Amino acid sequence: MAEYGTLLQDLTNNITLEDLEQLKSACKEDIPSEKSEEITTGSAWFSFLESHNKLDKDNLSYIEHIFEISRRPDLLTMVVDYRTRVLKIS
Numbered sequence: 001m002a003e004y005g006t007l008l009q010d011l012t013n014n015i016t017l018e019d020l021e022q023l024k025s026a027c028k029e030d031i032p033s034e035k036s037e038e039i040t041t042g043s044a045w046f047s048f049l050e051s052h053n054k055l056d057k058d059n060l061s062y063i064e065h066i067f068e069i070s071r072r073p074d075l076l077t078m079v080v081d082y083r084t085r086v087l088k089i090s
Contacts (some may be wrong), residue, residue: 011079020041023042
């Protein structure tokens with residue numbers, strides 16, 4: 001659980017204001033436009049993905065897809081690498 005939140009913060013730091021707009025566009029169908037106006041940070045965008053039951057805490061294949069279609073292998077890698085590390089932890 002803490003690892004999930006931690007990842008979101010690590011991702012947020014690697015998201016620019018322009019990328020945020022692109023990410024909001026990527027999830028324009030998942031997050032209501034009224035709620036996309038409430039987004040000021042990457043962490044806000046992430047919090048709506050949780051609030052709207054779009055990104056699972058354990059299943060991060062959703063956000064990996066979003067980063068794929070957003071053309072950010074870097075952000076995708078952050079999730080894949082981190083998630084793998086968490087899976088290794090036992």
